[PDB]
Structure 1
Amino acid sequence: FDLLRVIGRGSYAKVLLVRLDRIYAMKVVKKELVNDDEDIDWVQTEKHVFEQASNHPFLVGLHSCFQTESRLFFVIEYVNGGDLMFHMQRQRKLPEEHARFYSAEISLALNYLHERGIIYRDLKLDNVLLDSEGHIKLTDYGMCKEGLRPGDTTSTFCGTPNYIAPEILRGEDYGFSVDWWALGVLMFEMMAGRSPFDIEDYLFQVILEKQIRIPRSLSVKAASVLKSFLNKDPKERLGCHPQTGFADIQGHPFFRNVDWDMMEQKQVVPPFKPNISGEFGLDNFDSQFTNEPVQLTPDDDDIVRKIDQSEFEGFEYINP
């Protein structure tokens, strides 16, 4: 198609802005990475999430997918509002009311996956996304793990060093408890204005053996959700309860004010509508300088003859 700009450029994939007559966002994964022994799982996994997550309001939905021999292309809806990381620098710290809006919606998003069996595990201020209306969307279903949820604890050992679950660092079996810990780090940063880790391999040690300091300015309800969400024990941690895990989150005093049936229909009013910039909304969003020009890398024949398109079959075909 016609490719307007490069949005993000991770090692596994490249995110670039496109049009065809609506603006869309495209994540392109080279096929050599995913086509191997027990590697096909990441492309397949993300598709399943995207299929299950596209109906949900908060998790981002996927228009189309196409296949070329050299790469696999994902077309995802363009969100205009902005990422939280830019918001956090525009406003060092956010009120507790703003955090309740965002964090409440995020907990709904994670529960949907938890019910479905998927662990986001890439929860970050950047991975959340804001629409022009002020709601939240979660972006990169890439590190997710799906297909095993009730009575299943599995160790895939993925996380981000700052948002990493303490139980995971230990080498222990990880449930959906990691995702809730990531929430508390998110909530922490927005309300306090700083990472809870006073911010290489030193972080893993701090998280496991250093105390978390709640700002004195923080409301007592806020301290408790942080303490319970950022709790080191997966069994003690809030919302990792096997039976009654969402109600206690939902009935926590910090999130008493919300109406979650009402908020899920986007009925509740966002605290601050994001700034309306050019139809693209490129101004509000961060601008990363890895590759300013969008030129897809020229293919090498020797790889291309090795890739099996049997594995990459049934792409271009998306279920619900």
Structure 2
Amino acid sequence: SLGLQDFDLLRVIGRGSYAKVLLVRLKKTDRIYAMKVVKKELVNDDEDIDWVQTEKHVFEQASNHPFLVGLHSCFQTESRLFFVIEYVNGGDLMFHMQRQRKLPEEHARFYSAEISLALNYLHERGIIYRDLKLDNVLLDSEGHIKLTDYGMCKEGLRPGDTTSTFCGTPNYIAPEILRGEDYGFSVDWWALGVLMFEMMAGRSPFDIVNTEDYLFQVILEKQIRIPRSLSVKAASVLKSFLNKDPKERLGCHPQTGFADIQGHPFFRNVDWDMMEQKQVVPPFKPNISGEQLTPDDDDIVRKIDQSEFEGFEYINPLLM
């Protein structure tokens, strides 16, 4: 099926330790896509045994939702896995906050709404995102958000289920994870609380003036206080999403969790349905505005365990 031959490696658009993301062009179609590349050796050594399976499953659910990147195709070389993904060209919230420094409540309200719809959808599908942060919140040309990089997702969580992996991006990691407690969807809502805080305050609730051990101490012990300039509505949601007790945290009620959010005074006057069909207009249009592969290690590749990657190839019959 697909392979590197069928593509033109245009540029690099993302680079972590585990994963690398390229901008690519499907030759025979002249369409542009984003490509996520990961060394299969690290997939075996660093990830849960069902990582490949969880990724494929998550992309499936994401193709049927407006605020989630969908999967075009994926293939494998001897040493790497390749995820060809719907391309988003509006940048991300981090880039936006970089120029904005601080967003009006209306803007944060909009974004946090769309983010909630994407999250609740994953939760409904028994999935925990587990890595919501500014730069994982992409923006399309129109100005709507899109969650990307599903590398941290947990799958198959039934009602009452609970997982126990310590993961995430330190600044956004929930207290219940820090305590080593079994957790569920609650971590995602805490993450949104932290993200909402950055949007409206212009800084993290845990900014300063063992560096990471100290950060974890701040999150667990230091009292979270909302700045005096924010409205009573805003102060509430922040404090509610940022409740260190998963049981008492906003959006975490097993039954009325997501209803409690939509009902929150902060989200008053929000048409969720129109929000979900993109019938609500974004407060910022990235358009009209603003401003190669590492060689394999033959001694490693030769001994790689290809088991988990058998039958990895795939193409989506419906263009995401």
Matched, 1:211 2:223: yes
What is the CA distance between 1:226 and its match in structure 2?
Answer: 0.5
Quick check: which one's helix share is greater?
2
1:167-217 CA-partner distances (Å, limit 9, x unpaired): 110111111111000001111111111111134211111111111121111
**Local SS of the residue matching 1:4:** strand
Partners of 2:245 and 2:41 lie apart in 1 by 39
What is the CA distance between 1:37 and its match in structure 2?
Answer: 9.3
What is the CA distance between 1:266 and its match in structure 2?
Answer: 0.7
How big is the alpha-carbon RMSD for the aligned residues of Structure 1 and Structure 2?
1.9
Partners of 1:19 and 1:237 lie apart in 2 by 44
**Local SS of the residue matching 1:183:** helix
Question: Is the Cα–Cα contact under 8 Å of residues 71 and 316 in structure 2 kept in the other structure?
Answer: no
- Mean Cα displacement is larger for which, 7-16 or 191-200? 191-200
Name the residue aligned to 1:175: 184
What is the CA distance between 1:153 and its match in structure 2?
Answer: 1.4
Name the residue aligned to 1:13: 19
What is the CA distance between 1:144 and its match in structure 2?
Answer: 1.0
1:264-311 CA-partner distances (Å, limit 9, x unpaired): 1111111111134799xxxxxxxxxxxxxxx11222333333234342
Partners of 1:317 and 1:308 lie apart in 2 by 20
Partners of 1:95 and 1:219 lie apart in 2 by 11
**Structure with more contact order per residue of length (Cα contacts < 8 Å, sep ≥ 6):** 1
What is the CA distance between 1:36 and its match in structure 2?
Answer: 5.1
Matched, 1:26 2:38: no
Question: Is the Cα–Cα contact under 8 Å of residues 72 and 316 in structure 2 kept in the other structure?
Answer: no
Question: Is the Cα–Cα contact under 8 Å of residues 115 and 149 in structure 1 kept in the other structure?
Answer: no
C-alpha spacing 1:266/1:28, structure 2 compared with 1 (3 Å): same
What is the CA distance between 1:38 and its match in structure 2?
Answer: 6.9
1:43-83 CA-partner distances (Å, limit 9, x unpaired): 22111111111211101111111111121100111111111
Q: Percent identity?
A: 100
Question: Is the Cα–Cα contact under 8 Å of residues 237 and 264 in structure 2 kept in the other structure?
Answer: yes
Partners of 2:184 and 2:85 lie apart in 1 by 28
- Equivalent residue for 2:116, pick from 107, 127, 135: 107
Partners of 1:278 and 1:98 lie apart in 2 by 16
What is the CA distance between 1:86 and its match in structure 2?
Answer: 1.3
**Local SS of the residue matching 2:176:** helix
C-alpha spacing 1:203/1:263, structure 2 compared with 1 (3 Å): same
C-alpha spacing 1:123/1:234, structure 2 compared with 1 (3 Å): same
What is the CA distance between 1:13 and its match in structure 2?
Answer: 1.2
Partners of 2:197 and 2:48 lie apart in 1 by 35
What is the CA distance between 1:139 and its match in structure 2?
Answer: 1.1
Partners of 2:75 and 2:122 lie apart in 1 by 25
Q: Tell me how many residue pairs correspond in the alignment.
A: 305
Partners of 2:134 and 2:42 lie apart in 1 by 26
Partners of 1:194 and 1:300 lie apart in 2 by 41
C-alpha spacing 1:265/1:209, structure 2 compared with 1 (3 Å): same
- Mean Cα displacement is larger for which, 145-154 or 302-311? 302-311
Question: Is the Cα–Cα contact under 8 Å of residues 17 and 26 in structure 1 kept in the other structure?
Answer: yes
What is the CA distance between 1:96 and its match in structure 2?
Answer: 0.5
Where structure 2 has 5 or more consecutive residues not aligned to the other structure, the ranges are 1-6
